[PDB]
């Protein structure tokens, strides 16, 4: 097997050094693999024979070396080989690479009502959309008038977008009477000890 | 050159699964080893196995007595089965080009591996009982009253995941596709939207487009302004 630490961090411009290590690297040239959350791995590391990325190698260890590092850099980083009787190949664990340093970033919420025609289903959903957060944690709650909801709420967990912030969705089930019955409801988000709270209501265009 | 991956989605549990990887603008494919892996969620990427032209196949020693890759050269088009499914093989599975150099006599050994160069978008597995079931796609019409977010909101469908377009492809600016939300019922919905002029809203006719392939399924969804 191959071993890589499980996280590095560093700050921008810095260099970061991730390493792979493992018993086949000695005869076995390591090659080098980048994903991010939610896309396909990039090779960043081939073998070109018999510009911020370069590998090194030592015994048992090759070091994958990223100079002037930025937050586009954040990114799962693979290492991977071939046994040395040549009979597979394998990828080591991965390395979770942070960028520290980054600004904090205040959520952008998009409050939608259920649709007219979810209504005529019979059902009711609101779709609080959160993004543009960083870092990436937020609690949500929902409001039905000025009281909590206490059932019908779906939250995700966040997810990393493509420019390092982050994205959720919570949803509010109800029927279509308790959508009527109430003067409004709103769904209010809290990150970093701020909040930004958008409210709808049934008899609002 | 491009890989494009395609399977059922779903699995049943013992059954087996049989996925495929179409290769295009590849003009030397008999070169290269033609590679399957996986990603359990959150987890790293393993290695499952290739195939070479010759039709010479290397696995995953852990692996090896469940699966069998193939290799249709008229395509070209290569195929992964893996029998014997579990929840522990539910995941994103990927096709690759592990491309190969030559240098001198392959039969001395005279080649080597570039690396795993072309990678398809990978596509997504779960293993489950569960029946598969398409969405419900309600449209989330635009605000009122610059810039105006609109949407669809697809509901209730299993397993993952669906792809959102706008507009046949031709509207990518200001589209943002969220993650799914797990409901209690066991179905996923998640929401697309798009930001787009205010001043269009009247003009341009915004279409969702969401296909959920794993129930050979896909609906197109006028989003209009409220009445």
Redesign the interface.
């Known amino acids: 097997e191959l071993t890589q630490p499980p996280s590095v961090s560093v700050s921008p411009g810095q260099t970061a050094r991730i390493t792979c290590s493992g018993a086949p690297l000695t005869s076995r040239?390591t090659?080098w693999?980048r994903?991010k959350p939610?896309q396909?791995?990039?090779?960043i590391?081939?073998?070109?024979?018999?510009g911020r990325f370069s590998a090194s190698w030592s015994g048992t260890t090759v070091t994958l070396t990223i100079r002037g590092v930025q937050a586009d850099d954040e990114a799962d980083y693979?290492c991977?080989s071939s046994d040395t009787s040549d009979?597979?190949?394998?990828?080591?664990?991965?390395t979770k690479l942070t960028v520290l340093g980054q600004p904090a970033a205040a959520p952008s919420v998009?409050l939608?009502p259920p649709?007219?025609?979810?209504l005529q289903?019979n059902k009711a959903?609101l779709?609080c959309?959160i993004?543009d957060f960083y870092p990436g944690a937020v609690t949500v709650a929902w409001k039905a008038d000025s009281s909590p909801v206490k059932a019908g709420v779906?939250?995700?967990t966040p997810?990393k977008q493509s420019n390092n912030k982050y994205?959720?969705?919570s949803?509010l089930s109800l029927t279509p009477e308790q959508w009527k019955s109430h003067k409004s409801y709103s769904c209010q988000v809290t990150h970093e000890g701020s909040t930004v709270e958008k409210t709808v209501a049934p008899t609002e265009? | 050159v491009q890989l494009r991956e395609s399977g059922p989605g779903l699995v049943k549990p013992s059954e087996t699964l049989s996925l495929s990887c179409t290769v295009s603008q590849d003009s030397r494919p008999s070169d290269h080893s033609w590679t399957w892996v996986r990603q359990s969620p959150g987890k790293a990427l393993e290695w499952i196995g290739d195939i070479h032209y010759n039709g010479a196949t290397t696995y995953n020693p852990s692996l090896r007595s469940r699966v069998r890759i193939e290799l249709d050269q008229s395509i070209p088009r290569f195929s992964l089965k893996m029998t014997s499914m579990t929840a522990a093989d539910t995941g994103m599975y990927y096709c690759a080009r592990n491309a190969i150099r030559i240098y001198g006599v392959v039969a001395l050994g005279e080649w080597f591996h570039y690396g795993m160069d072309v990678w398809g978008q990978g596509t997504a597995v779960t293993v489950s009982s569960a029946s598969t079931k398409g969405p419900s796609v309600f449209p989330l019409a635009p605000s009122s009253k610059g810039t105006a977010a609109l949407g669809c909101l697809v509901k209730d469908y299993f397993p993952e995941p669906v792809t959102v377009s706008w507009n046949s492809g031709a509207l990518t600016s200001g589209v943002h596709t969220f993650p799914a939300v797990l409901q209690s019922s066991g179905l996923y919905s998640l929401s697309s939207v798009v930001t787009v002029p205010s001043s269009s809203l009247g003009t341009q006719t915004y279409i969702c487009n969401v296909n959920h392939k794993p129930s050979n399924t896909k609906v197109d969804k006028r989003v209009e302004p409220k009445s």
């Open positions: 040239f090659y693999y994903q939610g396909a791995p990039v090779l590391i081939s073998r070109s024979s018999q693979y991977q009979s597979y190949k394998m990828f080591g664990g991965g998009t939608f649709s007219s025609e979810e289903a959903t779709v959309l993004s779906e939250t995700t997810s994205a959720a969705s949803y265009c």
